[PDB]
Design an enzyme around this catalytic site. Structure first.
Site, PDB file in Angstrom:
ATOM      1  N   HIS A 114       0.855  -1.220   0.000  1.00 17.30           N
ATOM      2  CA  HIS A 114       0.000   0.000   0.000  1.00 17.30           C
ATOM      3  C   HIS A 114       0.884   1.261   0.000  1.00 17.30           C
ATOM      4  CE1 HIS A 114      -3.765  -1.963   0.625  1.00 17.30           C
ATOM      5  NE2 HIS A 114      -3.507  -2.481   1.797  1.00 17.30           N
ATOM      6  N   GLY A 122      -1.989   2.562   4.182  1.00 17.98           N
ATOM      7  CA  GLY A 122      -2.308   1.251   4.850  1.00 17.98           C
ATOM      8  C   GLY A 122      -1.114   0.681   5.598  1.00 17.98           C
ATOM      9  N   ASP A 149      -3.609 -11.109  -1.474  1.00 17.39           N
ATOM     10  CA  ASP A 149      -4.062 -10.552  -0.132  1.00 17.39           C
ATOM     11  C   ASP A 149      -5.498 -10.092  -0.395  1.00 17.39           C
ATOM     12  OD1 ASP A 149      -2.724  -8.488   2.478  1.00 17.39           O
ATOM     13  OD2 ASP A 149      -4.654  -8.055   1.656  1.00 17.39           O
ATOM     14  N   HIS A 151      -6.914  -7.369   0.123  1.00 20.09           N
ATOM     15  CA  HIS A 151      -6.985  -5.937  -0.342  1.00 20.09           C
ATOM     16  C   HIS A 151      -6.277  -5.684  -1.705  1.00 20.09           C
ATOM     17  CE1 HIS A 151      -7.259  -5.868   4.012  1.00 20.09           C
ATOM     18  NE2 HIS A 151      -8.044  -4.858   3.848  1.00 20.09           N
ATOM     19  N   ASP A 238      -5.407 -12.639   4.679  1.00 18.65           N
ATOM     20  CA  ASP A 238      -6.621 -11.963   5.241  1.00 18.65           C
ATOM     21  C   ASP A 238      -7.859 -12.503   4.495  1.00 18.65           C
ATOM     22  OD1 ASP A 238      -4.936 -10.488   3.285  1.00 18.65           O
ATOM     23  OD2 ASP A 238      -4.982  -8.722   4.551  1.00 18.65           O
ATOM     24  N   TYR A 277      -4.195 -11.227  10.080  1.00 16.65           N
ATOM     25  CA  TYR A 277      -4.512 -10.771  11.479  1.00 16.65           C
ATOM     26  C   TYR A 277      -5.123 -11.788  12.418  1.00 16.65           C
ATOM     27  CZ  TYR A 277      -3.861  -7.061   8.201  1.00 16.65           C
ATOM     28  OH  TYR A 277      -3.330  -6.310   7.192  1.00 16.65           O
TER      29      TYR A 277
HETATM   30  C1  CRI Z   1      -4.118  -3.879  10.418  1.00 18.66           C
HETATM   31  C2  CRI Z   1      -5.146  -4.517  11.369  1.00 18.66           C
HETATM   32  C3  CRI Z   1      -6.498  -4.269  11.197  1.00 18.66           C
HETATM   33  C4  CRI Z   1      -7.439  -4.833  12.046  1.00 18.66           C
HETATM   34  C5  CRI Z   1      -7.077  -5.675  13.109  1.00 18.66           C
HETATM   35  C6  CRI Z   1      -8.075  -6.232  13.912  1.00 18.66           C
HETATM   36  O1  CRI Z   1      -9.217  -6.195  13.487  1.00 18.66           O
HETATM   37  N1  CRI Z   1      -7.696  -6.758  15.073  1.00 18.66           N
HETATM   38  C7  CRI Z   1      -8.603  -7.302  15.873  1.00 18.66           C
HETATM   39  C8  CRI Z   1      -8.492  -8.632  16.245  1.00 18.66           C
HETATM   40  C9  CRI Z   1      -9.491  -9.210  17.065  1.00 18.66           C
HETATM   41  C10 CRI Z   1      -9.409 -10.545  17.472  1.00 18.66           C
HETATM   42  O2  CRI Z   1      -9.664 -11.425  16.665  1.00 18.66           O
HETATM   43  N2  CRI Z   1      -9.058 -10.802  18.708  1.00 18.66           N
HETATM   44  C11 CRI Z   1      -9.134 -12.216  19.193  1.00 18.66           C
HETATM   45  C12 CRI Z   1      -8.306  -9.790  19.526  1.00 18.66           C
HETATM   46  C13 CRI Z   1     -10.572  -8.395  17.474  1.00 18.66           C
HETATM   47  C14 CRI Z   1     -10.679  -7.055  17.098  1.00 18.66           C
HETATM   48  C15 CRI Z   1     -11.724  -6.231  17.466  1.00 18.66           C
HETATM   49  C16 CRI Z   1     -12.449  -5.545  16.490  1.00 18.66           C
HETATM   50  C17 CRI Z   1     -13.477  -4.673  16.815  1.00 18.66           C
HETATM   51  C18 CRI Z   1     -13.848  -4.435  18.144  1.00 18.66           C
HETATM   52  C19 CRI Z   1     -14.884  -3.542  18.466  1.00 18.66           C
HETATM   53  O3  CRI Z   1     -15.312  -2.755  17.644  1.00 18.66           O
HETATM   54  N3  CRI Z   1     -15.460  -3.528  19.736  1.00 18.66           N
HETATM   55  O4  CRI Z   1     -16.681  -2.849  19.936  1.00 18.66           O
HETATM   56  C20 CRI Z   1     -13.116  -5.135  19.124  1.00 18.66           C
HETATM   57  C21 CRI Z   1     -12.079  -6.013  18.788  1.00 18.66           C
HETATM   58  C22 CRI Z   1      -9.670  -6.522  16.289  1.00 18.66           C
HETATM   59  C23 CRI Z   1      -5.705  -5.919  13.276  1.00 18.66           C
HETATM   60  C24 CRI Z   1      -4.754  -5.349  12.419  1.00 18.66           C
HETATM   61  C1  CRI Z   2      -9.617  -2.150  17.134  1.00 15.74           C
HETATM   62  C2  CRI Z   2      -9.451  -1.837  15.651  1.00 15.74           C
HETATM   63  C3  CRI Z   2      -9.811  -2.770  14.689  1.00 15.74           C
HETATM   64  C4  CRI Z   2      -9.654  -2.499  13.332  1.00 15.74           C
HETATM   65  C5  CRI Z   2      -9.129  -1.279  12.870  1.00 15.74           C
HETATM   66  C6  CRI Z   2      -8.976  -1.066  11.490  1.00 15.74           C
HETATM   67  O1  CRI Z   2      -9.667  -1.682  10.701  1.00 15.74           O
HETATM   68  N1  CRI Z   2      -8.060  -0.183  11.150  1.00 15.74           N
HETATM   69  C7  CRI Z   2      -7.841   0.077   9.878  1.00 15.74           C
HETATM   70  C8  CRI Z   2      -8.258   1.262   9.297  1.00 15.74           C
HETATM   71  C9  CRI Z   2      -7.993   1.465   7.931  1.00 15.74           C
HETATM   72  C10 CRI Z   2      -8.335   2.599   7.228  1.00 15.74           C
HETATM   73  O2  CRI Z   2      -9.500   2.677   6.883  1.00 15.74           O
HETATM   74  N2  CRI Z   2      -7.405   3.507   6.961  1.00 15.74           N
HETATM   75  C11 CRI Z   2      -7.639   4.531   5.884  1.00 15.74           C
HETATM   76  C12 CRI Z   2      -6.015   3.405   7.541  1.00 15.74           C
HETATM   77  C13 CRI Z   2      -7.328   0.471   7.229  1.00 15.74           C
HETATM   78  C14 CRI Z   2      -6.909  -0.716   7.806  1.00 15.74           C
HETATM   79  C15 CRI Z   2      -6.251  -1.653   7.036  1.00 15.74           C
HETATM   80  C16 CRI Z   2      -6.560  -3.007   7.133  1.00 15.74           C
HETATM   81  C17 CRI Z   2      -5.910  -3.946   6.359  1.00 15.74           C
HETATM   82  C18 CRI Z   2      -4.923  -3.576   5.453  1.00 15.74           C
HETATM   83  C19 CRI Z   2      -4.271  -4.521   4.679  1.00 15.74           C
HETATM   84  O3  CRI Z   2      -4.666  -5.676   4.625  1.00 15.74           O
HETATM   85  N3  CRI Z   2      -3.146  -4.158   3.946  1.00 15.74           N
HETATM   86  O4  CRI Z   2      -2.852  -4.831   2.744  1.00 15.74           O
HETATM   87  C20 CRI Z   2      -4.614  -2.218   5.357  1.00 15.74           C
HETATM   88  C21 CRI Z   2      -5.262  -1.274   6.128  1.00 15.74           C
HETATM   89  C22 CRI Z   2      -7.177  -0.901   9.161  1.00 15.74           C
HETATM   90  C23 CRI Z   2      -8.773  -0.343  13.859  1.00 15.74           C
HETATM   91  C24 CRI Z   2      -8.932  -0.620  15.227  1.00 15.74           C
HETATM   92 NA    NA Z   3      -7.018 -12.180  -2.719  1.00 16.21          NA
HETATM   93 ZN    ZN Z   4      -4.783  -6.961   3.365  1.00 14.36          ZN
END
Ligand code: CRI
Ligand code: CRI
Ligand code: NA
Ligand code: ZN
Ligand code: NA
Ligand code: ZN
EC number: 3.5.1.98
Lengths: 348, 348
Positions: A114, A122, A149, A151, A238, A277
């Site tokens: 990204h 990203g 991936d 995305h 993912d 993740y």
């Molecule tokens: C780049 C990136 C983007 C997203 C996540 C992500 O979604 N992490 C991630 C992992 C897990 C999980 O599976 N656990 C067991 C902790 C749960 C969450 C998660 C997502 C949303 C919420 C929430 O909105 N609570 O109201 C809580 C927890 C996030 C991680 C990295």
């Molecule tokens: C607890 C928690 C769980 C999830 C996120 C989350 O989804 N973050 C979050 C926000 C955004 C976004 O919209 N941006 C413009 C940066 C993008 C991502 C994101 C997720 C996955 C990837 C990816 O797969 N890269 O190839 C990139 C970026 C994650 C944040 C907090």
């Molecule tokens: Na794919």
């Molecule tokens: Zn991705």
């Protein structure tokens, strides 16, 4: 035999930055746990140099990136050191391929697709994939980049949408509001790098079966209507079921047939990672793919490795798809495959 | 007037913890910018003490968190402090209500509905909502907790599974692989509290009208059947259209109505914020909602404040749905509406 870009210091490095988990360790720990590394040539990565990152990024950007990298978020601290490393890793993989050392080089901590020459997107501040592609150019005129991936691998597409020397294929989820948002099938590139950029919009719920059908036909068209000399495959996990992303319903096996399909070409392949993740699972996936590459069938009993307790509650290697619908209507996909084949009629 | 739990020290707290991005200053900065604060009572939160926290968590837990929070990621440092600060903030909000100081107490930085008494979960270490519910139980008897955050507020359901003194209602997404994974409509509480836990499992792409209409029906039946004395409302802004989560397609207005409804009841309400990983979006939402609480209409244009650039390129407070379909097959929704209304027969 494959090359495994690994060094303790690198793994530990890819488990740092303020918001990083210890995914590098879990992945290695399992590949190590099933003793797959024993069947690979391990190479220790270099740290790219500003001059090398600068082959694709603007001096200005690297200088700023760096500047901040120490300070933190006044962006955390490390990002530049971090980036430099993974970047270096990918380049080392390319270098080995170029130096007819291996025909498969692996950097599972790479795949940050990204980033742009002058911008981080990203949570990618370096486009280690471009840096490797460029590096492959030195001997390979045409490079093919496949992105499996979940995305859109924009960074890379974008990097090259003006040449026909680099062709990219990104299968990603495409839905209004889903990141990055770019990648519709009509996005074929610009100027002379038009029809040399492929994007296959998929929706949630695709499983191993339909995903591969799409993978194979697309790749099939490409291969002969582009005749590449090297491949850069990014396998962000993912799309695998379990993942927070909860979008596709794949298992390492599907991705594995897509991998075998490429490997058979017998071309210099650089294998990268990207998202994943669901730590345990991402590790299940690249450890599985690393087996595919070795031609080894893996046990389904997760060995007793430092991270064993995380492969609950069945402690096996297979992943089962979630019970979620496929919102992929089989004819729309045909409309896309058709379109693409048309677009390819413009690739010489 | 409503109470706004703000403290320089509290916002600086809430905007840091290694991977905690600055969402707290954004929300205040915009509420401050639209001058809403002037129409509220600003109350400075207290920090929670081991004992206040222990009201719900196990001393063992509290102390583990405490310890680590000092070391760091040897989970960063602060976590304990962070937890106790945000906790402290809900506790204060609730005491204000208890003292008949106001009828609404706001703490947009609380709503960590996934935490367990002895276990962190979904990024939540302390369950600042439970602690606030337990604080309302001094004066109030029947407390209702409504949770309109994309996810199931399991930590707060679990916490009260066997008491008919608290009824939790959660509208959330429920799909194989979507975290936390619980919340089916067949999860109605345990023993003494069977039928005192209400769950409404929705699918993606629901918008303001279908969403509100469901909310309203369950809350009507719940209000008349459980007849509450105080409310605790969590409004995690991860349902809004845009948001990384790309699951619901709501705007502050569909949530604004649920809130307005609850408010028609004239009961002591504690407002909690929650998820919302599209900062500008979340701030917009909670700024709209605080305006709902005040019953004022806001400028469509964004005032000019410290995080202005961040709301471009159309610098307004509204959000537009996305071009994604709704998957709430109408007939299935009703089935839920009925199981619930039938379950609400056995409530006194
Ligand atoms: C780049 C990136 C983007 C997203 C996540 C992500 O979604 N992490 C991630 C992992 C897990 C999980 O599976 N656990 C067991 C902790 C749960 C969450 C998660 C997502 C949303 C919420 C929430 O909105 N609570 O109201 C809580 C927890 C996030 C991680 C990295
Ligand atoms: C607890 C928690 C769980 C999830 C996120 C989350 O989804 N973050 C979050 C926000 C955004 C976004 O919209 N941006 C413009 C940066 C993008 C991502 C994101 C997720 C996955 C990837 C990816 O797969 N890269 O190839 C990139 C970026 C994650 C944040 C907090
Ligand atoms: Na794919
Ligand atoms: Zn991705
Ligand atoms: Na909810
Ligand atoms: Zn949430």
């Amino acid at each position: 035999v494959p090359v495994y870009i690994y060094s303790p210091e690198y793994v530990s490095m890819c488990d740092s930055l303020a918001k990083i988990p210890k995914r590098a360790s879990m992945v290695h720990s399992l590949i190590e746990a099933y003793a797959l590394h024993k069947q690979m040539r391990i190479v220790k990565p270099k740290v790219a140099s500003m001059e090398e990152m600068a082959t694709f990024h603007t001096d200005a950007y690297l200088q700023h990136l760096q500047k901040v990298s120490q300070e933190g978020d006044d962006a955390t601290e490390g990002i530049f050191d971090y980036a430099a490393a993974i970047g270096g890793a990918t380049i080392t993989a390319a270098q080995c391929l170029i130096d007819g050392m291996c025909k498969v080089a692996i950097n599972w901590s790479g795949g940050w697709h990204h980033a742009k020459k002058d911008e981080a997107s990203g949570f990618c501040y370096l486009n280690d994939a471009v840096l490797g592609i460029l590096r492959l150019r030195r001997k390979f005129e045409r490079i093919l980049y496949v992105d499996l991936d979940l995305h859109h691998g924009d960074g890379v597409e974008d990097a090259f949408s003006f040449t026909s020397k680099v062709m990219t294929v990104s299968l990603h989820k495409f839905s209004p509001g889903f990141f990055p948002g770019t990648g519709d099938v009509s996005d074929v590139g610009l100027g002379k790098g038009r029809y040399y950029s492929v994007n296959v919009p998929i929706q949630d719920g695709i499983q191993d079966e339909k995903y591969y059908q799409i993978c194979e036909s697309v790749l099939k068209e490409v291969y002969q209507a582009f005749n590449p000399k090297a491949v850069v495959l990014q396998l962000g996990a993912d799309t695998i079921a379990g993942d927070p992303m909860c979008s596709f319903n794949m298992t390492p096996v599907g991705i594995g047939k897509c991998l075998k399909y490429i490997l058979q070409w017998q071309l210099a392949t650089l294998i990268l990672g990207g998202g994943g993740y669901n730590l345990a699972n991402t590790a299940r996936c690249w450890t599985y793919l690393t087996g595919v590459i070795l031609g080894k069938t893996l046990s389904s009993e997760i060995p007793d490795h430092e991270f064993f307790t995380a492969y609950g509650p069945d402690y096996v290697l297979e992943i089962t798809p979630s019970c979620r619908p496929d919102r992929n209507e089989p004819h729309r996909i045909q409309q896309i495959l058709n379109y693409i084949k048309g677009n390819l009629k413009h690739v010489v």
